[PDB]
Ligand binder design. Structure first.
Ligand SMILES: Nc1ncnc2c1ncn2[C@@H]1O[C@H](COP(=O)(O)OP(=O)(O)OP(=O)(O)O)[C@@H](O)[C@H]1O
Ligand SMILES: Nc1ncnc2c1ncn2[C@@H]1O[C@H](COP(=O)(O)OP(=O)(O)OP(=O)(O)O)[C@@H](O)[C@H]1O
Ligand SMILES: Nc1ncnc2c1ncn2[C@@H]1O[C@H](COP(=O)(O)OP(=O)(O)OP(=O)(O)O)[C@@H](O)[C@H]1O
Ligand SMILES: Nc1ncnc2c1ncn2[C@@H]1O[C@H](COP(=O)(O)OP(=O)(O)OP(=O)(O)O)[C@@H](O)[C@H]1O
Lengths: 529, 520, 43, 93
């Protein structure tokens, strides 16, 4: 009576098709031809991937799919014991029924399943060096001997799931023992749509779901949500209304007259998106608000130019095929407000994955820690179809200081190597980097790594300054005219981030002294172009 | 004697009731005995309705009967003909919010109730039409002494469930192989058993982890204890959400360092309701003082001079524990004022009757006993200003006025949440005194001084961590002011060479332009 | 500190003994004789 | 079987006893059963005083009742309608 839709797994069609083809194909064909082919049966499966993408669900469903015995389940290190030689008796116990049934019924036995959960807890690599013998290597030897030894079994099937496929012993993965390996990754748009339908079918069945709720918009709006996160979203959306019909601040009471019109509306979904669920491979507006603190104002021509040059680069990385990796460097004098522009470009990129690596979160780290942190951040970006990454204040990242000079060599080597490693085939990455001292980087032989450069200027004319003031609107008509007469016949050299601070400092005086103090500060700052 | 928990089909027994008692008179309140499958049940007539309510009626072939189990009865009824299943509510009937004794945490409690208990109190039938599981965890974090354990205890004694198991820190570790995992596994056995036995009708279970960060750490990070900790973490992860499903548990954890806990343990489907308990504002202080001074007002032990609003105003950046300690010290003062026995303990009675806590006790205790961890300290200014300030010329006034301007700017601005300033001059000019006279007149609720003389002999990393700690503490107030003095001494500068500590310089340069969280 | 350590071997110890069992035979034997006597009396 | 440590308000049960057994004869050492909040308790008359000690008397509406738990009894009595009192001498001369 099995049926696929009853499984209730969405977005994993190809993986299941391959597993079925490789593992169960030979146990369903007519036996005579299979005998004429003289082939054995596959006896293993391994599943790996990032947390919360649907491994255990698949294992459980496979367990339910078969007309066989009841699977034996092992929960992590559930076999370890303290008495000498017991943690191997526990292992040997698992195969007794299979061995006996084989010996008795020959080639007509049933099928026995075994499921290892978190296999990497008891199957790490063997030390293979005298005096460095692992704490427990007898367990691995026993398991290897049992799965495929002198005597032959033909009625078992072993399934393992893990998060770190790099620690499993290599003799346990040769095509004789665990032959089929699968990676379970994040879904794309269609998978998200399927998952949402799967989880909303029941509600839609009993007219509990409002009419204004459209699934397609939600699917489009959620980018890089793992499987569990969509379920969490739906759960919170449900909980909201049920709360709406429960008054409890003195004594819990459930109004049962208006509790028969229960219906879920989109506003609940929007609120849940805003507050409750927060993805791990996506992005949220808090970061940008933290970096772009005062917005962006068009105080002159150059701004537009800069942005335009960003757009072009983005377009290239989306459509080019020869160059799956491009990079650019933004540079300029201090207090010119460059990191904000990089954040703006990245936000306008519309890529699914956006991350910002900044020194603000590495205070006091030793250089090794910095290397590892950067490596992890970059690695997380190799698991998407489109990525953009921002490196902020390179000079601070290297711990540079003019005296000596003195810097960290290891981090510099890490970066230099890491700007020309292409990602796994078929994926696209963009890197933006900000700095404030080009010459130093030139001496270190670093401008070769980057693909191009962009220049960010200061304010250099009275007209630009007056336009900026008008946009900010701090000074009114008469004061603006006075400032114009004072400054319109000269040249200026200042940065926007400094201009804001000057205005704020000036505003604290009395109503009839602000202009003079502002002018005095502007004079004293000094130009030195 | 024959009570059993086995299910009874209300449909079959209702059909048997119709068969046996057809064409028979029945009246409201009538008591009788019904035999169903050789089992005797006591039946009481509760309501009758004509096919209109009638005191007495005649049972016919097409009569309909709805059965409901009696109060406190273990009878298990299954079917649809029954109307009242007598689903015992999951909340004690006595509870009400006011008696909990928690003040200043209304929003957090509202959120927790909405997201964790809303689905366990709605009528079961509606819930079953949505096919949704229940949340499985809560996590709490914040600075010391703000009311986490209190909330956990109050929630624990909220529900009509059985007593909650408790794990006091790392009391599961052991030296022999494979003993810690056994201790972990022992916790869930009762829940597993009850689930297997009773399915959807099982009662609730609660487990409370204390100082969870002492056990669950990121896998592969630590060294020297990787094996044991990895095994423990793997066992816990497998048990909470494994191949076999559980639906009648709830796990509560609490910690002071929310960053060290593994990441795979904080995804939806596991501990997924994260809350932060912070310092209270004015209303919170008022509520806490009201809570902690109720009994005395009831028994007329509280003088008429004390005005709680003034006390709420005067205590800034206090935490709950300190608000409790203040009252305790105030009471102890009054109690000691009557007792008079230095030689040998000797209580009196004449004035042991008219005990009255007065304003003077509160003030004296407030000025001598309690010392808030996030407040302002006065001994510091006494130490750093040893001979006062002498007005010997205009420059002193100029400097003080400039300091005042900077203070006002930083308190009223919105586009400049962070400000800086540098004081410098020739040696022996007295910069430190002026700085600590511009901080004192600031009138901010949080002041601090970071001086090198508290780090004699430290290595670079120690100094870095100390400064980071000070700034982290400063990041938890609506206002602040920090004084860093003798920078060259911090850097260990010496003209020969030159020689200096690069790491500290980089840390300071980074910290000098980091904005606090929003609004501070 | 020290990683988790294995436990050592066990050495059980049987209780009953051959000579103590001869003594238990001494106990048991008299009962049958006493039984013959009581059966005689009842008869 | 029905022993419990739950508190019992001596005032309420004394009032109920007066209501139930008003205008009734009671003698020193008499044994009886009292129903309070659907709970059955064994009561033994220990002392009777005239409204002077008397062997037998009549319980009236305004008669005063003082209850004391039996030796080794787990009964938790609360309120002032009880003779038992506690005071700890945590200091000595
Ligand atoms: N493709 C999917 N379709 C439907 N539901 C899914 C899917 N993937 C995940 N889920 C949801 O995620 C829930 C929990 O996922 P699961 O138990 O597989 O976690 P996991 O991948 O084993 O996590 P971990 O890596 O921590 O072991 C499932 O019960 C299901 O509701
Ligand atoms: N047109 C603009 N371009 C850039 N920033 C702007 C503009 N208008 C306003 N701003 C604001 O000016 C500030 C620029 O500061 P930002 O941190 O970007 O400068 P920075 O060059 O990174 O600083 P530093 O060089 O000292 O490290 C931000 O608050 C930004 O929002
Ligand atoms: N919101 C509150 N209202 C009233 N009293 C409070 C509140 N929070 C704490 N208290 C009082 O202060 C005490 C603080 O102890 P508690 O165990 O709650 O702190 P804690 O957060 O566990 O401390 P730590 O986490 O550092 O161990 C409580 O026992 C109670 O007396
Ligand atoms: N008007 C004043 N201004 C500054 N200091 C004053 C004034 N009147 C008195 N003093 C006293 O002068 C002393 C100045 O010592 P202080 O430690 O502040 O100097 P300093 O610059 O830190 O010294 P050094 O440069 O050697 O480290 C203090 O005792 C201070 O109270």
């Amino acid at each position: 009576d099995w049926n696929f839709e009853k499984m209730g797994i969405g977005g994993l069609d190809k993986e299941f098709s391959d597993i079925f083809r490789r593992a169960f194909a030979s146990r369903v064909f007519p036996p005579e031809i299979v005998e004429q082919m003289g082939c054995k049966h596959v006896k293993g499966i391994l599943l790996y991937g990032p947390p919360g993408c649907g491994k255990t669900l698949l294992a459980r469903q496979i367990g339910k799919m078969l007309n066989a015995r009841e699977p034996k389940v092992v929960n992590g290190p559930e076999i370890l014991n303290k008495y000498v030689g017991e943690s191997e008796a526990n292992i040997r116990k698992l195969f007794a029924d299979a061995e006996e049934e084989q010996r008795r019924l020959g080639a007509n036995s049933g099928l026995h399943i075994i499921i290892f959960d978190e296999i990497d807890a008891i199957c790490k690599q063997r030390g293979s060096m005298a005096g460095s013998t692992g704490v427990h290597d007898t367990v691995v030897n026993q398991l290897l001997s049992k799965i495929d030894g002198v005597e032959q079994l033909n009625n078992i099937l072993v399934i393992g799931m893990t998060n770190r496929p790099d620690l499993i012993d290599e003799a346990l993965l040769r095509p004789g023992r665990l032959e089929v390996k699968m990676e379970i990754g994040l879904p794309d748009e269609k998978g998200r749509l399927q998952i949402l339908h799967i989880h909303t079918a029941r509600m839609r069945g009993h007219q509990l779901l409002s009419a204004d709720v459209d699934i397609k918009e939600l699917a489009v709006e959620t980018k890089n949500f793992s499987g569990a996160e969509l379920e969490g979203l739906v759960r919170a959306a449900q909980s909201t209304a049920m709360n709406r019909h429960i008054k409890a601040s003195t004594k819990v009471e459930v109004d049962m007259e208006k509790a028969e019109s229960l219906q879920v509306t989109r506003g609940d979904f929007l609120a849940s998106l805003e507050n409750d669920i927060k993805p791990a491979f996506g992005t949220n507006q808090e970061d940008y608000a933290s970096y772009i603190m005062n917005g962006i104002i068009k105080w002159g021509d150059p701004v537009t130019r800069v942005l335009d040059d960003g757009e072009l680069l983005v377009q290239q990385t989306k459509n080019s095929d020869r160059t799956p990796l491009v990079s650019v460097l933004l540079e300029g004098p201090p207090h010119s407000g460059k990191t904000a522009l990089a954040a703006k470009i990245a936000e306008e990129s519309n890529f699914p994955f956006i991350k910002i690596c900044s020194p603000d979160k590495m205070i006091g780290f030793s250089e090794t820690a910095k290397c590892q942190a950067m490596k992890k951040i970059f690695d997380d970006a190799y698991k998407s179809q489109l990525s953009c990454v921002v490196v902020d204040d390179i000079e601070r990242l290297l711990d540079y200081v003019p005296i000596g000079p003195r810097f960290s060599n290891l981090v510099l080597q890490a970066l230099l190597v890491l700007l020309k490693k292409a990602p796994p085939q078929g994926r696209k990455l963009l890197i933006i980097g900000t700095t404030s001292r080009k010459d130093v980087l030139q001496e270190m032989e670093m401008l070769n790594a980057f693909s191009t450069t962009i220049h960010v200027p200061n304010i250099a004319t009275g007209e630009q300054l007056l336009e900026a003031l008008e946009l900010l609107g701090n000074f009114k008509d008469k004061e603006r005219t006075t400032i114009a007469q004072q400054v319109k016949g000269k040249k200026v050299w200042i940065g926007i981030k400094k201009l804001l601070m000057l205005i704020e400092m000036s505003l604290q005086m009395d109503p009839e002294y602000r202009v003079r103090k502002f002018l005095a500060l502007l004079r004293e700052e000094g130009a030195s172009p | 004697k024959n009570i059993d928990s086995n299910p009874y089909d209300t449909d079959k027994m209702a059909a048997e009731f119709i068969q046996q008692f057809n064409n028979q008179a029945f009246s409201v309140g009538q008591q009788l005995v019904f035999s169903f499958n050789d089992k005797l049940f006591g039946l009481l007539v509760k309501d009758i309705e004509a096919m209109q309510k009638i005191e007495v009626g005649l049972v016919v072939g097409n009569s309909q009967v709805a059965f409901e189990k009696a109060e406190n009865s273990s009878l298990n009824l299954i079917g649809k003909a029954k109307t009242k299943e007598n689903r015992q509510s999951i909340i004690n009937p006595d509870w009400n919010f006011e008696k909990m004794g928690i003040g200043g945490l209304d929003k957090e409690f509202s959120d927790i109730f909405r997201r964790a208990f809303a689905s366990r109190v709605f009528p079961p039938e509606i819930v079953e039409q949505m096919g949704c599981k229940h949340v499985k965890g809560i996590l709490l974090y914040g600075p010391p002494g703000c009311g986490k354990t209190l909330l956990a205890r109050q929630i624990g004694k909220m529900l009509n469930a059985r007593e909650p198991k408790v794990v006091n820190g790392p009391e599961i570790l052991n030296k022999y192989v494979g003993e810690s995992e056994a201790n972990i596994r022992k916790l869930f056995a009762d829940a597993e058993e009850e689930q297997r036995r009773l399915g959807a009708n099982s009662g609730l279970h609660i487990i409370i982890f204390d100082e969870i960060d002492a056990i669950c750490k990121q896998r592969g990070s630590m060294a020297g204890s990787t094996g044991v900790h990895d095994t423990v973490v793997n066992q816990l992860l497998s048990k909470i959400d494994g191949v076999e499903q559980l639906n009648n548990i709830l796990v509560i954890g609490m910690t002071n360092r929310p960053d060290l806990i593994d990441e795979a343990l904080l995804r939806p489907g596991r501990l997924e309701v994260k809350m932060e308990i912070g310092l209270p504002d004015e209303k919170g202080r008022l509520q806490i003082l009201h809570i902690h001074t109720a009994r005395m007002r009831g028994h007329q032990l509280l003088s008429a001079d004390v005005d709680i609003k003034e006390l709420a105003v005067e205590t800034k950046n206090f935490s709950g524990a300190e608000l409790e300690g203040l009252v305790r010290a105030a009471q102890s003062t009054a109690m000691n004022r009557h007792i008079k026995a230095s030689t040998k303990v000797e209580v009196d009675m004449e004035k042991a009757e008219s005990l009255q806590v007065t304003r003077g006790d509160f003030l004296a205790s407030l000025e001598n006993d309690i010392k808030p961890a996030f407040g302002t300290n006065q001994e510091d200014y006494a130490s750093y200003i040893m001979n006062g300030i002498i007005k010997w010329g205009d420059p002193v006034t100029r400097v003080l006025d400039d300091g005042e301007l900077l203070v006002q700017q930083t308190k009223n601005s919105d586009r400049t949440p962070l400000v800086s300033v540098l004081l410098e001059g020739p040696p022996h000019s007295g910069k430190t005194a002026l700085a600590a006279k511009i901080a004192e007149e600031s009138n901010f609720p949080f002041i601090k001084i970071c001086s090198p003389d508290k780090m004699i002999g430290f290595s670079e990393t120690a100094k870095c961590q100390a400064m980071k700690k000070i700034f982290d503490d400063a990041y938890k107030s609506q206002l602040s002011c920090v004084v860093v003095d003798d920078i060259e001494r911090l850097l260990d500068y010496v003209p020969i060479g030159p020689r200096f500590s690069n790491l500290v310089l980089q840390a300071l340069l980074v910290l000098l332009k980091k904005a606090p969280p929003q609004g501070r | 500190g020290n990683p988790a350590i294995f436990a050592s071997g066990i050495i059980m110890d049987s209780s009953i003994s051959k000579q103590a069992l001869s003594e238990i035979e001494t106990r048991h034997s008299e009962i049958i004789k006493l039984e013959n006597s009581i059966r005689e009396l009842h008869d």
